[PDB]
Amino acid sequence: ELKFLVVDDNSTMRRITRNLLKELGFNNVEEAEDGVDALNKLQAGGYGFVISDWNMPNMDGLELLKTIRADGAMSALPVLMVTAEAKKENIIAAAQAGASGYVVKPFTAATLEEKLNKIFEKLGM
């Protein structure tokens, strides 16, 4: 099934996220610790959905998005962006960069499932 890549420099939050997906019925989850590490794996190919935090070292979430978007082979990857902030100028940034959606943390498996389904709905999966 859908192979997810959870990107976040916080080991705990990657853990929570990995678990909410597990609960939602997605056990094919892999993880990365920053944009650079994420891209290193994405280039290997095989991932179907990307969930990344906004603030990370080396390569943050927004640059990780622009890069993914600019790479013809990774251009089609749905990227769900996780922010701590509610709705400032970030959501516009992600919107312009081409995010598939955002979700403020922390979140419940219910909020997550709803966002996943809105995205799944637009792409038709």
| Residue extents of the structural domains in the chain | 1-125
Q: Rounded to whole angstroms, how far apart are CA atoms 33 and 12?
A: 11
Q: How far is CA 51 from CA 12, 110, in A?
A: 15, 16
Binding residues: 8-9, 53, 55
The answer to whether the peptide bond before residue 78 is cis (omega within 30 degrees of 0) is: no
Asked: is 1-125 a CATH 3.30.565.10 domain? The reply is no
The helix/strand/coil state of 31 is: strand
Expressed in Å, this structure's resolution amounts to 2.4
Q: Rounded to whole angstroms, how far apart are CA atoms 92 and 28?
A: 30
Binding residues for Mg(2+): 8-9, 53, 55
Distance of CA 124 to the CA centre of its chain: 18
Angle formed by the axes of helices 61-70 and 90-97, nearest 10°: 20
The HSE-up count of residue 110 (CA atoms within 13 Å, CB side) is 0
